[PDB]
Ligand binder design. Sequence first.
Ligand SMILES: Nc1nc2c(ncn2[C@@H]2O[C@H](COP(=O)(O)OP(=O)(O)NP(=O)(O)O)[C@@H](O)[C@H]2O)c(=O)[nH]1
Ligand SMILES: [Cl-]
Ligand SMILES: [Mg+2]
Ligand SMILES: [Zn+2]
Ligand SMILES: [Zn+2]
Ligand SMILES: [Zn+2]
Lengths: 134, 168
Amino acid sequence: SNTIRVFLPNKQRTVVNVRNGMSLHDCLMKALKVRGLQPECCAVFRLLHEHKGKKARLDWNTDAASLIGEELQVDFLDHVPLTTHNFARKTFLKLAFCDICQKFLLNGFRCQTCGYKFHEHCSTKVPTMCVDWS
Amino acid sequence: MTEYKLVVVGAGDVGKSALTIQLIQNHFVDEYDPTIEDSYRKQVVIDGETCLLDILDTAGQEEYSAMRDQYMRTGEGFLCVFAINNTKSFEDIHHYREQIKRVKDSEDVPMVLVGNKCDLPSRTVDTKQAQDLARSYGIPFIETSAKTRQGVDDAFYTLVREIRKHKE
Ligand SMILES: Nc1nc2c(ncn2[C@@H]2O[C@H](COP(=O)(O)OP(=O)(O)NP(=O)(O)O)[C@@H](O)[C@H]2O)c(=O)[nH]1
Ligand SMILES: [Cl-]
Ligand SMILES: [Mg+2]
Ligand SMILES: [Zn+2]
Ligand SMILES: [Zn+2]
Ligand SMILES: [Zn+2]
């Protein structure tokens, strides 16, 4: 009953059950980290069901209980170097090694953006967010 | 890239969240953390095709049964999870499949029976029982341990392959 519905980056969401005294940050750290998202790379917003403004930024240390029954959204900060991978299949003619298991890689997959290279059966261990400082 | 909407269902304490987080973040913790509603997106390569899994992890209890109804309506495939050391969670699988059939108006729904916690020695549901249940339902059975990652990819890959067959 003491819950908040929180939309999260990359079209994800969580419903948090608020323990009194906890901040928004306390309530959402795990949800973000388990999705491979750093809290330091994000901002939290209150959704405004009114025109001329879709959302209003909130302080991360805001008391969570005070927003029970509202809808919040966590978004990436402007221009953070995080994106989604762009996987392509790749045959490695020269000897190559998987970035996940360090075994030989002959037929595999490779992110065209960050260069992560891996076996098909290692793909679920590739980090969720692609880091692009190129 | 094709997106696959998956829903993880089953009784409380059977490891639905642990299985999902193992898949998403390659990580296992022993902490019990009650789920109300959690969706995750993750790219995966399955049979040489990159696809996007959109995974919904649900609460098992009757309080949220009307929420589950809506989740299940748009779900394309279902992981029905029980714990191999909890016979009640195994028999309760039947209630979740009945619930899914109600919102899908079909018996032909992509579905995998998942027997989790296979690392534990206190096993009360044996492999043969679960295969028989899965056979009577016409769906695959996969043994998993979210603790060791055993069979975790296999459960989600098998469900995607069931969805692909169904969409033929
Ligand atoms: N040994 C072992 N423990 C497991 C395994 N999977 C989950 N557990 C443990 O079982 C407990 C419940 O796990 P959890 O994923 O939260 O279960 P749940 O199905 O999400 N329950 P709920 O519906 O309340 O959200 C935790 O202590 C977790 O560590 C497994 O494969 N092996
Ligand atoms: Cl090797
Ligand atoms: Mg859970
Ligand atoms: Zn990448
Ligand atoms: Zn590998
Ligand atoms: Zn029952």
